[PDB]
Every structure is written in structure tokens, then in C-alpha cells.
């Protein structure tokens, strides 16, 4: 009888599915986590076009497993306590059309035995801290990496060191240390455990998909360090830029988080409303919240200029500078400037034409834009002290201009006629050269 | 003043008896435990015919002690904190007609000093885990055995390892390990501690009485292993069979608990409504709940057959088999059969007449009852390969019968005429002998 | 060294090399979690299995199953006899399937090979579930159709001079229409009194598929037991099975032993 099986549970951790007579006894009601988990189930099931295979690690009394099997999922639940599995099975038998199997076993061994594709979704709620406590953080990171490797999505509720108990001392400084080796992760909620006032964060993690409520797609590769608070995911015709505002440990000062926030916000604003006369990459999706923000754009051909420079690839500096200057002059005509023109913000296509790819540093108002013209000289010099004729003549001509006349329209016009300009080396000069050379060091 | 004494309490653990101004401050309200404890007090006081002497171990602020003294109990409360005892005494003085004494002291030393008969009831609520933590499980088991030895009843609320605190690690795997050496125990409730979502079980324990709400009687001996989930208590004219459905540790699989449940349930059903033509032992009391079930029956004279066989006692196999077969044939005539006729289910009285004593295996419907007739041959053989004439002739005659004719009426009729039946050894036979001999091995 | 890799799905020893540090060579392994990588057959698989129903592994791809037997295993794992039996069964299975008897639909063979360490066989993938799984997972089964279909194929084998030494639930696959077929031919044999022992085990099979026999299955078995033993064979077993509804009622006879001998066998 169920009555007996429930009584022999060492703990009624969860609601007993279908049996509200024990709801008052359950340590956690599970309705809040279930609301969120079912939402994520539906998103992923919608994206894949079918009911999911779900793995429930440390499934306890089966509540999540049964609740998802109720919605048509095929589920396997694992727990190392016989009493828990006995209850799960008895509950499944009350619901014979549910495709639900349960097994006694250890999560460590199950994870090792998993095969990719066997399960679409795995859930591991409030169980990994037990594995951390016995086996350490590094083994748990590797288990979670494998779990992510073999599924499409993982949902974790993770206990945290701020919980007032003795086992908190063995926890990592931040729960994200268990998952940050995985490609994609997002905080999706925080839950009351009824053990203390400290809530546990729930994360959605994937090694194969961008999983954003509005955009759910496989990616084939990703990158953290461009050219660690920013991640880029590459899919067939998209790039997803994912910025963390909230990072663990020291990592971001207050100012840096706000700048991450500012840049991504500014980039969204610009790309959703780009200026006429400028071909901006197209925007497929975007959103922001307290922890992070994201932007999905059309994927552009070409390579990042800084990579090409580093990997000594052959470049046409004339075509790169011409194309870039043309776009900067067109921005300026619409009252837009870019505050940070550097090789890692520039992409060069197969025909050696260049374009900006980060619009975080775009600005709309201001003497000005004189400083930006100055840096652009450094850019130029780093792209190559190092300027042959007629690039040196171009820079010399600009320096002879009254400063109120420095702007990108002028920079472009002089660039286009640089072959006609007088020879700098024939003049006393000589300072423009030395100031930028010191700038280009500085 | 009471105000000062209460303030100097390191903790207001309990309601301050008579002083509801501190009820909001009390860690535990105590009303739920008190409701249950008073019920048990009344049962035992009713059974003994008088007010009880009660011992309250780790009595804290005296709530249980005073509440029972209010109902006419004579109480002694023990606690090792002076501040707690000061409050208890001040409260007792506000209630001068209560027969209540309080002493500072250690439970370990008090238990050692107890004399049998001094107290009828001892209560030890949420205190033994402190003794486990400092002295270990084995010393605590011995203290609890002595406590049970010297009282009529013990009520314990026991902390458990699932509680989230550091001291949980020192607790036994299951709280029943502290008490299972005692003769009689029953779970009577589970209580919220307000420290966590994990409740503490309350047990009623005795080394001298069966304490079931409907049946409250001394017993003079008891037994676990017949001939450990089943216990038998023997009193003057009764035997109480007590089956645990819920057992600690691995001990019972789900199927085994259900079979314990099934057998005891089936036995109750049969004995409360026995078939005409069959003398069944009489039923004095019975009940079942999630954890266990019990049945109190009239006590039958005689010895269990398997004991007599083991202790090589002299037996009359003719009279045993005759009497048993007669009762089996009468059952069968009423549409009843017994699925498990074995020596440990048979009792033999002084005149060598035998009867069944376990009706867990009784069944009412089904080719059949051919299998049961087959086992009965094994029974027969074990009661003695080993069959002399005319027992061998009896079995041979049965084997020559078409199988649709095998039943206990036939078995009995052939048994009664076995001296007239043809000699098996004069026939080719020979197989019935070898099949049962292999069965009787198997 | 295999302890570092045996958790991976597919592995094969491909050579052994002199290190010039000592006379002890180092093995080179080819390992994959995604493909069967056999020189003749190189294909993705989508799942794999070790324990059927650990020296044998099965890889499942879109229209194939690859059976991979280790003859050479680490540690204690295989005695000499067991390795040779792995070798024998896989060899025997290859021989049978590459040259199957007329009158028997055998799964088709896509690739195969053997060497010192292991042997492999890639076959067409058959629909259905393994009978022992269905029994374990209490799935609904039609014992009439399973036994009928299986007996028909066994009788046809026998007519071609072939028998199967090990008819058990884990060697039988049942399709959606409840028709059954053998899927392991390691235990096929060609010569021998006989095939009387095999007929006997088939009764156990029958009983485990359900002591436990209702009419007319019990009548069928009783009829077989009344036959002189030189007449026991699968053609007879099949013929009596097809007419079992007409056969006399066993419970009306003294019997009774055939029942008890198989019940003890079915324990044993
Ligand atoms: C704190 S409970 C969480 C239960 C459930 N996941 C939930 O949050 O509602 C941890 C569960 O995981 C199980 N567990 C802990 N370690 C395990 C392991 N190594 N393998 C399988 N189950 C494990 C326990 O038996 C227990 O049921
Ligand atoms: C957790 S409180 C339980 C109080 C009370 N029995 C109740 O549950 O309402 C434990 C009490 O036992 C007392 N105590 C602990 N160890 C003791 C010992 N060895 N001897 C006497 N009292 C003890 C403490 O002073 C404290 O008042
Ligand atoms: Cl966790
Ligand atoms: Cl306790």
C-alpha cells in the first residue's frame, strides 16, 4: 500500500503526486519549481517538435518526473534510496499510461553511463551539493559537463555556501563555478527551500543550444574571450552575443557590469533603429534582465581584423581603411560616431572590405570629434614610426588643418586624395609622427 | 520572580505552564505532543486503575510534568540545567496541590539509579540525541532498555539523522535502532520541531505490557524469530501477534511489507469470520495502520511442531497427520485451503492432536488444489526416501488417481484406509517416491 | 590499459609498438563514442548496449546492428573456455548467416571479421522487442502467436538439419504483430539420442513463458510425453501444437509426472 511506502520514507521531501493528503507533510511543495520547469519543458519540446525524454537525477518521490510524464514526457528517475524509488514506482502504477521508469542508483554512475541523444532534458535539483560534499568540486564540474554534453538542456537547482549549515563550508564560493565550464547558462529563478531564508538559484544550462525564451536554436560553436563576462554563440545564420552583468567572485566591478549593461543596451538601440546610409547587421532577437542581456544578430562573413593581424594573414590596408572610413563618414553625416575603432571591433570579408561589428561604443553627441580622429591615427599606425608615403602624407595633411575642421568626412576626403598630397618628409613636420608613435605605444 | 527566572533561561524551549505571555516566545508550543501524551497517560492509568507516577527526563521548563500533575499524576522532572529547574520549581509553587518534584541531574545517572516500580511512565522527548552525540548509540540503547525495564511504559520523541544539522551525522541510520531491543514498540505520532521541515517520530515502548489503544495488558514473555518483522507477546490467556509493515534499513522490500500486510489482514478476516466445521482460535482484538498491524488471539495449548522436531521430542505422526488432515478436509468442504502447511505453522497439544495456527496463507479460490496436495507430501516426508509402509502405500494410491481428483477430502479418505491399500514396494512405482524426495530437498 | 577506455562505447586494439625503452610494447587503441570503426564498415551509431537483456557489445545504427564480441578481455573476466565460446558462437553465427538454410528467413549480413582479440558481425536491424524484456517489463504478449511462429521456424530448421541449442527469451525477438524469431545463432548446430534434450528444454522455455500451464498447453505437453522418445523432434512438437485444442485433457489422466519434472526443470 502507498500509505506504508510513504511512511517508510526517511523524509517526505516532495509532494506525493496525486496524493494531497501528504502535502502538509512535504518539506517542499514543488509547485513553484514545477511551474518553471514545465515552461522550459514546453519551450524545448516546441523547438524539437516532439515530446521529450527526460532524466530526473535524485528524483526523490517522483514529483517532477510524474508531473512531466503527465504532460507526455518519457521519463527516467534515479535515486540512491530504495524507499524513494518504491514510492515512485507505486505512484507510476497508479498512472499506467505515464511513460515513467525509476531505478535505484548513484548519479555518478548513471552520468558515466549516459549516451548522447538518449535524453533531451536532464534535471538535477538540490542533489549535486551532496556529490560536492563527498567527491569535491572538480569531479562535479566534470559530471555536469558530461551531463550537458549528452543532453540538449540541463536544469539545475544548486545549494549555496550562504546556507547556514555545516555542509555549506564545502560548497564552492559561487554555484556558477560548477557550471561555467558549460557553454550556455542562464539563471531562470530562485527558490525558498524552507530550511532557511537563503534561496537556491535555478540555472538552465546547455552545451548544444541557445535557450532563450524567444530564441531556441542549436549552435555549432561558441567563444568566450573575444579575439570572460561575454560569450558568443555561432549557429547556421546567427551569432548570439551574451553579456553577463552579474558575474561571480571579484570578476566585474560595479562600473564594469554597468558598462556591459550600457554597451549591450546601446548596441540593441542602434541596431534596432539603424541610421540610413549605414548597413548594420540585422537583429533577430534580444532581451535583458538583472543578470545578463543577449542579442541575436545575422552572422556576417569574414574574419576579425585582429585575428588576421595576429595570424599574420595577408591584408589590403587600402581597402580596409577605405571601406571603414567610408562607413565612419556616413555615420558621422547621420550624427553617429564610434568611440572605440580597434582591430577587434572590425571584420574583414573575402574581398578585403571592412565593417564594424561592435556597436556598444556608438555615440550620438559630443571640441569634437577631434579625439576620435586622433585615435583613428593610432588604429592606422597599429594596422601597420610605421607609415609609408602616402599614408604619412595623409596624416600630415590632417595635422595642418585647424582642429575645428577635424572630422571623419575630412579624414575620408583626404584619404581618397592621399596620392596627390604633398610629401611629409619634405617638410619640417615632424611631430605628428612622434605624437602618434608615443600614442601608439600609449 | 518568575519574570526573572524565565529571562535567565538560556532558551524558552517550552510553553511556560500557566503563563501564556511567553507562548509567542516558546520554541515549541507543546500542545500537540501533550494531546497525545495525555491520551496515553489516560489509557495506562485506566489499565492500572490509578493515577501514575511519571518520570520526565530532560524536563526543560516543566510543561509536560506540570500538565500531567494537573491531571493528578505524581511527577518527577529531571534536567541538567539549573535555570530550567529553577523555573519548574517556581511554577510548581504556583500550583501547590500538584505532586511535582524537580531535580538538577544527568539522565545517565538518574536512569542508573531508578528502581523498578518507582515510576509507571517515563517520557523522554527530544533529549536522547544529546546523549547519543556525547556517549554513542550502544550506551543509549542500554539506558533505554533499563528505562523500559523499570517502568510500565516509555514515550520517546527521537531526533533523526535527516534533520539538517551537524549533529545529525552522529545519529543512527534509523531512530528505531535505539529501541528495537525493547520488547514492544509502536509509532504513535510525528511532530514539527520548528527547526526544520523534518519531523520527529514519537514512540510508545514497553518491556512489560502490550500497549494498544484497545488492548492494554501485561505480557510475561515475547518472541521475535518464530520457531524480525513479526513479534509475539504471550500473556495469561492471550497471544498478541504484532507485524511490522514499516521496518528500518533494508529489512523489508516493498513486496515483503505488502505480504506482511496481506497475511495479517487475511488472518484477521478469516478469524473474525471463520468457516463452520472448523475450530479457529478466538479473536480478542485487532487493528492495522501504516506502520504495522496486530492481532490478539486466545492462547492455545501445545507446542509448535517444528520445535518438537528440532528438539527431537516424541511425536505421534499418525495422530498429528490424522488431526491435521481432518481439519484440512473440513476447510476444503467450506471452500477454504491453506497455502503453506509447514511444521512452523502447526501446533501439537498434549494428546498429540494438531492444528494450524497461522492463517495468513488461507485462500478461497483457485487445476487445483493439486499443487497444495503435492506440498502436503513434502510436509509428510519432512515429518519423517523416508516413508515406511503404510504411509508409502497411501502416497502411491494418491499418485494413481487422475489429477482432477486430487484434493484434501481424498487425501483424508485414503489416509484413513491406508492399512488396507496395496503395497507400493510390490509395484513398479517408483517415481512418486523420487519426485517428492527431490521436492523435499527442493 | 583498457580500464582507461572501457567506459567508451567502441574500442579495438589496432596495433602494438616497440618503445625502445624496454621489451614491453604499448598497445594502440581506436576508440569512439559515435561510430563503429571497422576497416570494412565505418558508420555512426545512435545507441549501444553492453549487457544483453560484459564481453559482448551491440551497436545500433539506422538500419544495422553490430555485434562486437571480445575474445580477449582484461582482468579475470573470461576464462580460456569462455573466450573460446565467444569465439565459437560468433564464428558459428557468421557461418550460418552467410550461408543460411532455405526455408528460413535469417537476418542479412552486412559485414564481419574476426581477429585475435575480438570478432564482429554487422547485420540488418530487425523490428520488435526482445522477449525477455517484454516479460520483465510485464508487456502484453500473445503466447499462442509467439510459440506458433517460433515452432514453425524451428521445425523448418530441423527439416534442413539444423537445430538451436539455446532457445531462451533473451534469444527471441517479437515484432508488433506478435510473431517471434530467433536472433542469436551462436547456438545453432548441425548434427547430434537426439534432438530429445532440446525438446525437453523447449518445455521449460514454454513454462517460463508462462506448474503454470493451462489447458490446452498442458494437453500438448502430455501428448508429447506419451510419445516414444525416438519420435521427439520439432516437427512433432509443431504438429501437436497446431492440434492442441483437439488433444485429450491431461488432468483427466494419471499423468502426472511430466508436469512435475518440468516444474523441477524450470526451477533447475
Ligand atoms: C535533497 S533531495 C532532492 C530531491 C529532488 N531532486 C527535489 O529537489 O525535489 C536529494 C535526493 O537525491 C538522492 N541522491 C543523493 N545522492 C544521490 C546519488 N549519488 N545518486 C542517486 N541519488 C542520489 C537522494 O536520495 C534524495 O532523494
Ligand atoms: C531539546 S530539550 C527537550 C526538552 C523537553 N524534554 C521537550 O522536548 O519539550 C533537552 C532538555 O534536556 C536537558 N538535558 C540534556 N541532557 C541531559 C542530561 N544528560 N541529563 C538531564 N537533562 C538533560 C536539557 O537541559 C534540556 O532541557
Ligand atoms: Cl545542489
Ligand atoms: Cl531525541
**Interface contact C51, partner A, CB < 8 A:** no
Please tell me what DSSP assigns to residue B274: P
Residues 6+ apart with CB under 8 A from A252: A229, A244, A245, A246, A260
Helices and strands, number each (H, E), in chain C? 7, 14
Q: Are A244 and A229 in contact (CB under 8 A)?
A: yes
Report the nearest atom of ligand 2 relative to the CA of B123.
Answer: 6
Cβ-count burial A131-164 (b if 16+ within 10 Å, e if not): bbbeeeeeebbebbbebbbbbbbbbbbbbbbebe
Ligand 1 close to Cβ of residue A12 (< 6 A): no
Which residues crowd ion ligand 3, with CB under 5 Å? A 126, 128-129, 158-159
Determine whether the interchain pair C264/B442 forms a contact, defined as Cβ–Cβ distance below 8 Å. yes
**Cell, residue A339:** 568611440
Residues 6+ apart with CB under 8 A from B196: A194, A195, B163, B164, B165
Residues 6+ apart with CB under 8 A from C151: C234, C237, C238, C241
Determine whether the interchain pair A1/B164 forms a contact, defined as Cβ–Cβ distance below 8 Å. no
Report the nearest atom of ligand 2 relative to the CA of B108.
Answer: 19
| Grid-cell match 532577437, residue found | A285
**Interface contact B247, partner A, CB < 8 A:** yes
| Nearest-angstrom CA–CA distance, B57 and B6 | 20
Cβ-count burial C250-266 (b if 16+ within 10 Å, e if not): bbeeebbebbbbbbeeb
Q: Are A94 and A5 in contact (CB under 8 A)?
A: no
| Nearest-angstrom CA–CA distance, B394 and B413 | 10
| Nearest-angstrom CA–CA distance, B415 and B398 | 10
β-strand partners of B238: B298
Phi-psi region of C3 (alpha: psi -120 to 50; beta: other; left: phi over 0): alpha
Report the nearest atom of ligand 2 relative to the CA of B84.
Answer: 27
Cβ-count burial C193-223 (b if 16+ within 10 Å, e if not): eebeebbebbbbbbbebeeebeebbbbbbbb
- Backbone phi and psi for residue B155, each to the nearest 5 degrees, phi listed first: -115, 125
**Interface contact B396, partner A, CB < 8 A:** no
Atom 24 of ligand 1, residue of closest alpha carbon: A58
How many Å lie between the alpha carbon of B34 and the closest alpha carbon of chain A? 20
Q: Are A59 and A102 in contact (CB under 8 A)?
A: yes
Distances (CA, A) of B41 to B47, B83, B201, B286, C255: 10, 28, 18, 21, 66
**Cell, residue B196:** 526544520
- Cα A12–Cα A16–Cα A20 angle in degrees, nearest 5: 110
**Interface contact A214, partner C, CB < 8 A:** no
Residues of B in contact with C253 (CB under 8 A): 402-403
Q: Helical H runs in A23-81? A: 31-48, 63-70
Would you call the peptide bond into A369 cis, given omega within 30 degrees of 0 as the criterion? Answer: yes
**Interface contact C265, partner B, CB < 8 A:** no
Q: Are strands B53-57 and B74-79 parallel, antiparallel or unpaired?
A: parallel
Q: What is the resolution of this structure in A?
A: 3.3
Determine whether the interchain pair A117/C47 forms a contact, defined as Cβ–Cβ distance below 8 Å. yes
Considering every ligand atom, which ligand is closest to the CA of A135? 1
Q: Are B296 and B215 in contact (CB under 8 A)?
A: yes
| Nearest-angstrom CA–CA distance, B84 and B61 | 5
Residues of A in contact with B196 (CB under 8 A): 194-195
| CATH no., domain B1-219 | 3.40.50.150
Atom 10 of ligand 2, residue of closest alpha carbon: B127
Residues 6+ apart with CB under 8 A from A98: A66, A69, A70, A75, A92
Q: Are B14 and B24 in contact (CB under 8 A)?
A: no
Task: Kindly give the interhelix angle for C143-159 and C234-242, rounded to the nearest 10 degrees.
Answer: 140
Mutate to test the interface with C, among B366, B367, B438, B439 (most CBs of C within 10 A): B367
Residues of chain A with CATH 1.10.510.10: 301-442
- Which 3 state secondary structure label does DSSP give A3? helix
Residues touching ligand 2 (Cβ under 6 Å) are B 13-14, 58-60, 78-81, 84, 105-108, 125-127, 130-131
CATH topology (fold) of A220-300: Phosphorylase Kinase; domain 1 (3.30.200)
Ligand 1 close to Cβ of residue A126 (< 6 A): yes
Residues of chain B with CATH 3.40.50.150: 1-219
Ligand 2 centroid – CA B187 distance (Å): 21
Distances (CA, A) of A85 to A14, B253, B260: 13, 11, 20
Mutate to test the interface with C, among A53, A115, A146 (most CBs of C within 10 A): A115
Q: Are C203 and C181 in contact (CB under 8 A)?
A: no
Half-sphere exposure of B229 (CA within 13 A, CB side): 22
Nearest Cα to A28, choosing from B194, B163, B197? B197
Neighbouring chains to B with at least 3 Cβ pairs closer than 8 Å: A, C
Distances (CA, A) of B45 to B59, B66, B189, B287: 21, 17, 20, 22
**Cell, residue C140:** 502484453
Determine whether the interchain pair C7/A116 forms a contact, defined as Cβ–Cβ distance below 8 Å. no
A106 is in an annotated binding site: yes
Burial class (CB in 10 A: 0-12, 13-18, 19+), A350: exposed
For residue C56, count other CB atoms closer than 10 A to its CB.
Answer: 17
| Nearest-angstrom CA–CA distance, A279 and C116 | 65
**Cell, residue A72:** 507526455
A61 is in an annotated binding site: no
**Interface contact C210, partner B, CB < 8 A:** no
Q: Are A408 and A331 in contact (CB under 8 A)?
A: yes
What is the experimental method?
X-ray
Q: Which residues of B are annotated as a binding site?
A: 13-14, 33, 58, 79-84, 105-108, 125, 226, 230-232, 241, 263, 298-300, 347, 358
**Interface contact B276, partner A, CB < 8 A:** no
Helix, strand, coil proportions of chain A in percent (round to 5)?
40, 20, 40
Which residues crowd ion ligand 4, with CB under 5 Å? B 126, 128-129, 158-159
Q: Which residues of C are annotated as a binding site?
A: 52, 56-58, 67, 89, 124-126, 173, 184
| Nearest-angstrom CA–CA distance, B143 and B149 | 10
**Interface contact C255, partner B, CB < 8 A:** yes
**Cell, residue B384:** 519423517
**Cell, residue A303:** 574574419
Nearest Cα to B347, choosing from B299, B294, B289? B299
β-strand partners of A318: none
How many Å lie between the alpha carbon of C8 and the closest alpha carbon of chain A? 9
Residues of C in contact with A117 (CB under 8 A): 46-47
Ligand 1 close to Cβ of residue A58 (< 6 A): yes
How many Å lie between the alpha carbon of B398 and the closest alpha carbon of chain C? 10
Q: Are B384 and B378 in contact (CB under 8 A)?
A: no
Ligand 4 centroid – CA B88 distance (Å): 21
Long-range contacts, stretch C94-98, CB < 8 angstroms, 24+ apart: C94/C119, C94/C121, C96/C162, C96/C185, C96/C188, C97/C121, C97/C123, C97/C185
Ligand 2 centroid – CA A11 distance (Å): 25
End-to-end CA distance of chain A: 78
CATH superfamily of B301-442: Transferase(Phosphotransferase) domain 1 (1.10.510.10)
| Nearest-angstrom CA–CA distance, B329 and B337 | 9
End-to-end CA distance of chain C: 39
Structurally, what CATH architecture does the domain formed by C46-126 represent?
2-Layer Sandwich (3.30)
Distances (CA, A) of C26 to A284, B362, C13, C29: 53, 68, 11, 10
Q: Are strands B153-157 and B184-191 parallel, antiparallel or unpaired?
A: unpaired
- Backbone phi and psi for residue B110, each to the nearest 5 degrees, phi listed first: -60, -45
Ligand 1 close to Cβ of residue A107 (< 6 A): yes
Residues 6+ apart with CB under 8 A from B180: B248
CATH topology (fold) of C127-268: Transferase(Phosphotransferase); domain 1 (1.10.510)
**Cell, residue B353:** 492432536
How many Å lie between the alpha carbon of B410 and the closest alpha carbon of chain C? 15
A32 is in an annotated binding site: no
- Which of B164, B199, B257 is nearest residue A195 as measured by Cβ atoms? B164
Q: Are strands A153-157 and A121-125 parallel, antiparallel or unpaired?
A: parallel
Residues 6+ apart with CB under 8 A from B157: B33, B124, B125, B126, B191, B200, B201, B202
Neighbouring chains to A with at least 3 Cβ pairs closer than 8 Å: B, C
| Nearest-angstrom CA–CA distance, B123 and B75 | 11
β-strand partners of A206: A184
Determine whether the interchain pair C9/A115 forms a contact, defined as Cβ–Cβ distance below 8 Å. yes
- Strand ranges, E, within B143-291: 153-157, 184-191, 200-206, 209-212, 215-218, 221-223, 230-234, 238-244, 283-288
Strand order in the sheet with B99-104: B99-104, B74-79, B53-57, B121-125, B153-157, B200-206, B184-191
| Nearest-angstrom CA–CA distance, C110 and C112 | 7
Determine whether the interchain pair C256/B439 forms a contact, defined as Cβ–Cβ distance below 8 Å. no
Burial class (CB in 10 A: 0-12, 13-18, 19+), A348: buried
Ligand 1 close to Cβ of residue A143 (< 6 A): no
How many Å lie between the alpha carbon of B257 and the closest alpha carbon of chain A? 8
- Strand ranges, E, within B84-145: 99-104, 121-125
Determine whether the interchain pair C251/B402 forms a contact, defined as Cβ–Cβ distance below 8 Å. yes
What kind and span of H or E run contains A216? strand A215-218
Amino acid at each position: 500500500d502507498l500509505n506504508t511506502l510513504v511512511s517508510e520514507l526517511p523524509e517526505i521531501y516532495q509532494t506525493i503526486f496525486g496524493h494531497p493528503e501528504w502535502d502538509g507533510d512535504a518539506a517542499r511543495d514543488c509547485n513553484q519549481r514545477l511551474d518553471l520547469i514545465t515552461e522550459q519543458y514546453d519551450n524545448l519540446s516546441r523547438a524539437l517538435g516532439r515530446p521529450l525524454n527526460v532524466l530526473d537525477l535524485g528524483c526523490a518521490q517522483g514529483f517532477f518526473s510524474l508531473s512531466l510524464a503527465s504532460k507526455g514526457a518519457t521519463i527516467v528517475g534515479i535515486d540512491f534510496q530504495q524507499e524513494n524509488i518504491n514510492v515512485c514506482r507505486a505512484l507510476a502504477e497508479e498512472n499506467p499510461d505515464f511513460a515513467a521508469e525509476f531505478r535505484v542508483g548513484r548519479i555518478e554512475e548513471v552520468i558515466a553511463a549516459l549516451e548522447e541523444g538518449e535524453f533531451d532534458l536532464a534535471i538535477g535539483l538540490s542533489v549535486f551539493h551532496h556529490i560536492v560534499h563527498l567527491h569535491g568540486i572538480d569531479e562535479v564540474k566534470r559530471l555536469l559537463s558530461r551531463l550537458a554534453d549528452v543532453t540538449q538542456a540541463v536544469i539545475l537547482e544548486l545549494a549555496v555556501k550562504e546556507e547556514p549549515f555545516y555542509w555549506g563550508v564545502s560548497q564552492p564560493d559561487d554555484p556558477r563555478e560548477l557550471i561555467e565550464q558549460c557553454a550556455f547558462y542562464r539563471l531562470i529563478g530562485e527558490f525558498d527551500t524552507h530550511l532557511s531564508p537563503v534561496p537556491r538559484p535555478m540555472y538552465l544550462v546547455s552545451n548544444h543550444r541557445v535557450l532563450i525564451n524567444d530564441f531556441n536554436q542549436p549552435f555549432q560553436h561558441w567563444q568566450n574571450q573575444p579575439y570572460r563576462s561575454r560569450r558568443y554563440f555561432f549557429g547556421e545564420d546567427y551569432v548570439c552575443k551574451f553579456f553577463y552583468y552579474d558575474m561571480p567572485h571579484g570578476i566585474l566591478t560595479a562600473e564594469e557590469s554597468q558598462r556591459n549593461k550600457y554597451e549591450l543596451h546601446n548596441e540593441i538601440k542602434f541596431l534596432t533603429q539603424p541610421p540610413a546610409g549605414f548597413d548594420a547587421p540585422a537583429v533577430l532577437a534580444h532581451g535583458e534582465n538583472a543578470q545578463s542581456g543577449w542579442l541575436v544578430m545575422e552572422k556576417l562573413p569574414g574574419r576579425l581584423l585582429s585575428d588576421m593581424l595576429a595570424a599574420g594573414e595577408e591584408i589590403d590596408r587600402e581597402k580596409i581603411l577605405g571601406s571603414l572610413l567610408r562607413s565612419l563618414a556616413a555615420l558621422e553625416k547621420q550624427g553617429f560616431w564610434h568611440d572605440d575603432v580597434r582591430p577587434w571591433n572590425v571584420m574583414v570579408d573575402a574581398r578585403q572590405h571592412a565593417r564594424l561589428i561592435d556597436f556598444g561604443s556608438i555615440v550620438t553627441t559630443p571640441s569634437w570629434p577631434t579625439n576620435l580622429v586622433q585615435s583613428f591615427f593610432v588604429f592606422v599606425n597599429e594596422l601597420f614610426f610605421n607609415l609609408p608615403q602616402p599614408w604619412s602624407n595623409w596624416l600630415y595633411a590632417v595635422w595642418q588643418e585647424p582642429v575645428e575642421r577635424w572630422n571623419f568626412v575630412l579624414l575620408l576626403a583626404l584619404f581618397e586624395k592621399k596620392a596627390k598630397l604633398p610629401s611629409a618628409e619634405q617638410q619640417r613636420g615632424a611631430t605628428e609622427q612622434w605624437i602618434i608613435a608615443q600614442e601608439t605605444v600609449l
